[PDB]
A paper describes a structure:
Cyanobactins are a family of ribosomally synthesized and post-translationally modified peptides from cyanobacteria. The only enzyme function remaining to be solved in the patellamide cluster is that of the FMN-dependent cyanobactin azoline oxidase. The oxidase converts thiazolines to thiazoles, with some enzymes also capable of the oxidation of oxazolines to oxazoles. We have reported the first structure of an oxidase protein from a cyanobactin pathway.
Here, we present ThcOx, the first novel structure to be solved by in-vacuum long-wavelength macromolecular crystallo­graphy on beamline I23 at Diamond Light Source, and its subsequent high-resolution structure solved by molecular replacement. The protein crystals belonged to space group P412121, with two molecules found in the asymmetric unit. Hence, molecular replacement was needed to phase the high-resolution data. The structure is composed of a novel domain and an FMN nitroreductase domain. Each molecule in the asymmetric unit consists of 16 α-helices and 17 β-sheets (structural figures were created using PyMOL v.1.5.0.4 from Schrödinger). The final structure contains residues 3–222 and 233–469 in chain A and 1–222 and 231–473 in chain B. In both monomers, the missing residues are located between α-helices 7 and 8 (the linker between the two domains) and at the N- and C-termini. PISA analysis infers that the dimer is biologically relevant, with each molecule containing a single FMN. The N-terminal domain contains a portion (residues 7–86) which, by visual analysis, supported by Phyre2, possesses the same fold as the leader binding domain of TruD, the so-called ‘peptide-clamp domain’. The remaining residues in domain 1 (87–194) form a second peptide-clamp domain, but its binding site is buried by an interaction with the other clamp domain and thus it is unlikely to be active. The peptide was included as there was evidence that it may bind to the oxidase; however, there was no evidence of any density for the peptide.
Numbering used by the authors:
A (entry chain A): 3 to 222, 233 to 469
B (entry chain B): 1 to 222, 231 to 473
The structure:
């Protein structure tokens, strides 16, 4: 009914003696002794030349009408699972990217109604194809003919109200497209949620493109090839090393504030004592929150991770990709500047001294925290992306941000148990930070911030 | 270079013309010219129109104010290029618009024509206002596509193999589309100068990034106060979903303040536990757990917020802007005094509310959690965390969703530590299908959606000595 059907590229088709197996990651379909007409039709689906009506004829022609009716019936189950692509050749191919899949071809009325390309639709290069995608679609459209890119260019260039009945004459003149191809193309674009039929929205207005795209893509064995580039702790930045104090955790296991007290007492504190936080306090704080407790090689892993660490917080895949850079404006036995915390040696390493660039990071934290007392220490959290990205496809960055939160709450509770003044910070300029430190922004970048000062009695 | 392209003022720039002064104005910078001479004024007007070259603009100034004034004009104009005030165009094809200060366009060496190149994987086309725009998180420019023939060129570039060499492949582009070789060379020079092309066709530590991750990172890691206009639509707690309400137990927190596990013990003992006891977690345990982690402790109106937030709550975890946009849906496969199904936790009344009973759809959410935690024991309870986006999006521009995800983490660690103090079996779950969940519950995915998951069962006691 209107499109050429074909199998998803994600689908694999193991053909053998006696059996035919159709296979995705999720689902498996075995056909034992499939009849010639059905086999012929399954081959033409792999080619992609044909309509449902034509595929049904192939089955019936050899296996009879009941077999063909069964085939069409059972084939729409596979459409639901996202196994069937719909194409308008030679222009475009819709590929499902989700289960529970459906294409409602719209009413003829669309031709006289004002429409527009969705503000969430975008074109980009996927592998060796141009693809049209949207966080609002269950499909990605592979652009086969460059003349489709010309059509989208004109749609985006049009005014708010593009009406196909009055504006299609331009598209058909300059580009050598027939009216029936162009009508089928628009029907697919509407069916795959790339078009707006109401130019107005209601609770979709509130979303920004980059947020909805990220949410969509993250809410659906690999080898650690670059293990030597992204080791379990970062290679030392500076030859200067300031050793930090180590508290007696066995003593604290019985002496420390209770978990219930820590949770119920926890506040964000932005006003500080005149006496800055001490180096001894910073040292105890970091040991309790972020140290390397052990180093182990997992004896089995086929992913070839090599060495990994255990730390005082949980972390997706283990791996522990975050680093901590204490930016010191005021501290006990510490000159002002940017440091890097080294969690295995339990040491600080100077990264940069107090310049105008480093001061503006402290100003941003101060401004972000309501201008309610000059920061003493700001902990800038960074992520070494290569430590995690190899393992996680689309969810790596969403894991990282949940790790920042995991760390924030750990900082909050330990700070509360030490009578320090904690506050998370929502924003920060990563390009400014990457420039101050030595960092390639693609390799490592700030993803979180946390202010820490001495609290008043 | 300013000679290879035609010049215009950024659309973000505004030009207040008055009897004796001329003011050029962005959000950041302000330039006042007192008694500017006719030739300079004429040239500044044509920059606002666009479509003239540096050479032509210099002629306009010189024609009326003399050659020295024109030389001065061209010299001083490259200061404005640095501030992001000047667009560079290859008419009638494309116009590069700066989106950042400290702006520079290094037109590449002729060598690019014989070198293998490719469109950046981070370059993307989308509809901005009434134009098609090419953008990248790796660029300081956005290119407005003026001619559809540029979209055809990009379509072919993306369709090409790893190694597209202009010297050997440009013949196709020039044949089918009516473009001249000099237009096409200028276009490619601009695309290279604005970071839309790769000259090392292989990358190094940029390969590892997926488009949606790099875009989100760049936009979230970069004025009058906003108003909470839809406060009534997004109140401090969600309106009750079901009439059935199962009340939950409330522990003595004053007693726990002294009797509970220490914070150090909780942190040092915390483990992810995926294997469970035969006895499922009880309703009394679930109730104590949620009270300690996620209840509304107080309701207050802030007496002088100008943002008109109205009522807000305090809870056992911190939250960006306060506001507390998250909800918790306990999905119960096995529990003490609770039939299997999906519930919603109500943090002010401290009650559970049935959302959906045990269907094949609800079972597949439990299967996904089981599969995600290694298939190491059937889940007992899975806590699905959701976000009511309108509670937060009004206040935060580009960072709202990154705050939400940090809140999920904040909650995960709170769940982990309390579970550890209660001797329960906790584990965070990295992924989950929001569409499937939104369908099972009653939810519009644009209004509210799952953003986190956490499994919780009864732990074994067990030994090792
Ligand atoms: C954000 C986040 C997501 C996680 N996702 C999963 C998951 O999908 N599956 C799983 O088995 N464990 C998950 N975990 C638990 C980690 O795998 C665990 O912290 C680590 O592998 C081992 O540390 P632990 O045993 O000290 O918790 C997650 C943890 C965090 C912080
Ligand atoms: C992810 C996150 C980001 C935050 N960002 C900021 C911030 O930018 N500025 C600020 O003053 N407080 C920030 N906070 C602290 C909250 O404002 C605070 O938790 C809440 O306003 C008051 O609750 P509390 O005093 O119990 O923490 C943040 C908290 C979290 C969890």
């Amino acid at each position: 009914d209107l499109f050429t059907l074909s199998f998803s590229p994600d689908l694999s088709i193991a053909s053998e003696a006696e059996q035919l197996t159709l296979q995705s990651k999720d689902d498996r379909l075995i056909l034992e002794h499939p009849q010639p007409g059905l086999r012929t039709a399954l081959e033409q689906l792999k080619q992609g030349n044909l309509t449902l009506a034509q595929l049904t004829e192939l089955v019936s022609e050899q296996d009879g009408v009941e077999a063909g009716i069964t085939f069409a019936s059972e084939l729409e189950k596979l459409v639901d699972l996202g196994w069937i692509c719909h194409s308008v050749l030679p222009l475009i191919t819709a590929i499902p990217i989700a289960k529970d899949y459906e294409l409602n071809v719209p009413d003829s009325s669309w031709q006289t109604t004002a429409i527009a390309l969705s503000r969430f639709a975008f074109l980009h290069q996927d592998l060796q194809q141009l693809v049209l995608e949207s966080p609002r679609s269950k499909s990605k459209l592979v652009i086969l003919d460059w003349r489709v890119g010309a059509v989208i260019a004109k749609l985006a260039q049009s005014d708010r109200g593009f009406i196909f009945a009055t504006s299609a004459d331009s598209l058909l003149a300059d580009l050598s497209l027939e009216l029936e191809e162009l009508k089928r193309l628009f029907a697919l674009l509407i069916a795959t949620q790339m078009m707006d039929l109401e130019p107005e929205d209601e609770t979709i207005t509130q979303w920004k493109f980059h947020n909805l795209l990220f949410h969509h893509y993250t809410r659906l064995l690999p080898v650690f090839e670059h293990r030597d580039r992204y080791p379990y702790v970062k290679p030392v930045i500076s030859t200067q090393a300031i050793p930090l104090v180590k508290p007696d955790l066995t003593a604290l296991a019985t002496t420390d504030m209770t978990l219930t007290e820590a949770i119920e007492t926890r506040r964000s504190i932005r006003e500080y004592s005149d006496q800055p936080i001490t180096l001894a306090q910073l040292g105890e704080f970091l040991y309790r929150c972020a140290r390397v407790k052990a180093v182990y090689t997992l004896p089995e892993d086929p992913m070839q991770v090599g060495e990994s660490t255990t730390r005082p917080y949980p972390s997706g895949g283990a791996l522990y990709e975050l680093e901590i850079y204490p930016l010191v404006h005021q501290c006990g036995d510490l000159a002002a500047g940017l440091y890097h915390y080294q969690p295995l040696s339990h040491t600080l390493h100077p990264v940069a001294d107090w310049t105008p660039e480093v001061e503006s990071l402290v100003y941003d934290a101060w401004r972000a925290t309501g201008q309610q007392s000059i920061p003493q220490i700001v902990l800038i959290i960074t992520a070494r992306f290569g430590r995690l990205f190899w393992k996680y496809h689309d969810i790596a960055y969403s894991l990282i941000l949940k790790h920042v939160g995991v760390l924030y709450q750990t900082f909050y509770l330990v700070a509360t148990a030490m009578q320090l003044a904690p506050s998370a910070i929502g924003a920060g300029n990563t390009t400014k930070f990457c420039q101050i430190a030595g960092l390639n922004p693609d390799e490592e970048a700030s993803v979180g911030e946390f202010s820490l000062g001495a609290a008043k009695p």
